[PDB]
Amino acid sequence: DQGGYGFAMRLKRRNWYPGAEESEVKLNESDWEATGLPTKPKELPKRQKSVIEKVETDGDSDIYSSPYLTPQPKNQATGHENFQYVYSGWFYKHAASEKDFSNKKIKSGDDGYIFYHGEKPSRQLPASGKVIYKGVWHFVTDTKKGQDFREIIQPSKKQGDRYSGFSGDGSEEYSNKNESTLKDDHEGYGFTSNLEVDFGNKKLTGKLIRNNASLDKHTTQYYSLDAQITGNRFNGTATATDKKENETKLHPFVSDSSSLSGGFFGPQGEELGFRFLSDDQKVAVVGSAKTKDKKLTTVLDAVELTLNDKKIKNLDNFSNAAQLVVDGIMIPLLPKEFTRKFEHTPETKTYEVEVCCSNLNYLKYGMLTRKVEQSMFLQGERTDEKEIPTDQNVVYRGSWYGHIANGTSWSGNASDKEGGNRAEFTVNFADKKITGKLTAENTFTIEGMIQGNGFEGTAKTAESGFDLDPKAYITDAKVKGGFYGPKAEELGGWFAYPGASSATVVFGAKRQQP
């Protein structure tokens, strides 16, 4: 979707002051909150935790949270419990009532959040095969006067009416979360998720169930899931398994959702997080799942090349070339005209960014400066390896940002004109062969082999030295890159030297046509 490390949704409490009563408080897409990057996924998300810390109590000040979270119920899919990258769950307080009679506000009930968050969003995934993910899921409901969800939460405290139904409520007493052993057909403890991810076809399906207390089949299914995978993200729908027919509907899971979204985390996407909001705005869900406890394709490139030390770091990215993720904050690259330039301060003081180009849509590259640090960056969404064209002669044209020196330093931005930085590449896909040239003043020569949706080769200053306007002699510099966008219209790469002349360069070119 619009990408992020995580999302949280707060419980609602309904005003029941007589004469100024809200009959209902619905959930809204706008209610979703970003969590930010967690240092430790097992801990509560910091922004929302701080909110709850300040929530007033009167008799019980503790924060209660999902049992596997960092402060004897269980909530886990057996064989799939050792999360390292992604956590979902809930936390709350027995919040004091708001009793503001002269402003006509009375509110009572728990206050808290459901959430998921993760670290290390994936840049590679299995190339093929169907893989089973299991884990947990959580929910929070709207509030409506007279409403109860007695099938899921015993309504002695007006859960669903005065404050949201949620999966952490003390009266959620129909799951097996407190039992000591499992029935033969239980998937685990409490509310659990089961997803089948088809990396071959870039899609996934799943089921969200409750494992039922034993006091006849022991689970109940509330949703099935369907989603398309794009890069490290996925988007789709949730289908309510029991909606309204012969029943008056004793639970909140009665409407489909068209807003299922999530993403993969970890080295090869072995964990995932997701959320959705029901179309009738009655229920929000978050969840997490992982491969069983213990060949790849690359879906994106996102790198930072630091000048001062010529070093190259991987950046996080949510499979969106136009969204630059640095230091856990998200910097957009298009203003909701070749190249571009601007600065940005969140909430390092400010970020200065120069980005190219206007004609590129799956690939962005340029300059990044913190304040003072300076780096180049490149990020792109790789084309599916199965979409790599077979054409034997393909020309790409564009530019590049350059920083090089054997004595004094030369720096040159990218440009469309005139004798400024220019790049050209000819690719023989059939041969798995790639070559091209970068010129400043009319010089590097690059040979490489294509592998899947990526390439790898060398860049040399040739013979001998370059200019510095003193000869810089770079030869056998490792060059890595990729093809971005559908059907590989855009391509990009970078190189650092060494692995008395230095060099750091990002470049990107666009495909032509007869």
Question: Where along the sequence are the contacts to a copy of itself (CB under 8 A)?
Answer: 18-24, 144-147
Three-state SS at 509: strand
| Other beta carbons within 10 Å of 304 | 20
Residue (160 or 188) nearer to a copy of itself, CB: 160
Residue (145 or 183) nearer to a copy of itself, CB: 145
Q: CA 383 to CA 371: how far, in whole Å?
A: 35
What is the closest distance, in whole angstroms, from the C-beta atom of residue 320 to a copy of itself in the complex?
A: 42
What is the closest distance, in whole angstroms, from the C-beta atom of residue 197 to a copy of itself in the complex?
A: 40
Answer whether 273's CB lies under 8 Å from 88's CB.
yes
What is the closest distance, in whole angstroms, from the C-beta atom of residue 159 to a copy of itself in the complex?
A: 14
What is the closest distance, in whole angstroms, from the C-beta atom of residue 161 to a copy of itself in the complex?
A: 9
Q: CA 118 to CA 320: how far, in whole Å?
A: 17
What is the closest distance, in whole angstroms, from the C-beta atom of residue 371 to a copy of itself in the complex?
A: 49
Answer whether 157's CB lies under 8 Å from 165's CB.
no
Q: CA 502 to CA 57: how far, in whole Å?
A: 61
Residue (74 or 162) nearer to a copy of itself, CB: 162
Secondary structure E strands in 440-511: 444-451, 454-460, 477-484, 490-497, 502-511
What is the closest distance, in whole angstroms, from the C-beta atom of residue 146 to a copy of itself in the complex?
A: 3
Q: CA 142 to CA 100: how far, in whole Å?
A: 22
What is the closest distance, in whole angstroms, from the C-beta atom of residue 147 to a copy of itself in the complex?
A: 6
Answer whether 301's CB lies under 8 Å from 481's CB.
yes
Nearest to 99 by CA among 9, 10, 13: 13
DSSP percent split of the chain into helix, strand, coil, nearest 5: 5, 50, 50
**DSSP code of 40?**
S
Answer whether 468's CB lies under 8 Å from 439's CB.
no
Q: CA 119 to CA 323: how far, in whole Å?
A: 17
Element of type H or E holding 47: helix 46-54
What is the closest distance, in whole angstroms, from the C-beta atom of residue 25 to a copy of itself in the complex?
A: 11
Three-state SS at 352: strand
Residue (147 or 323) nearer to a copy of itself, CB: 147
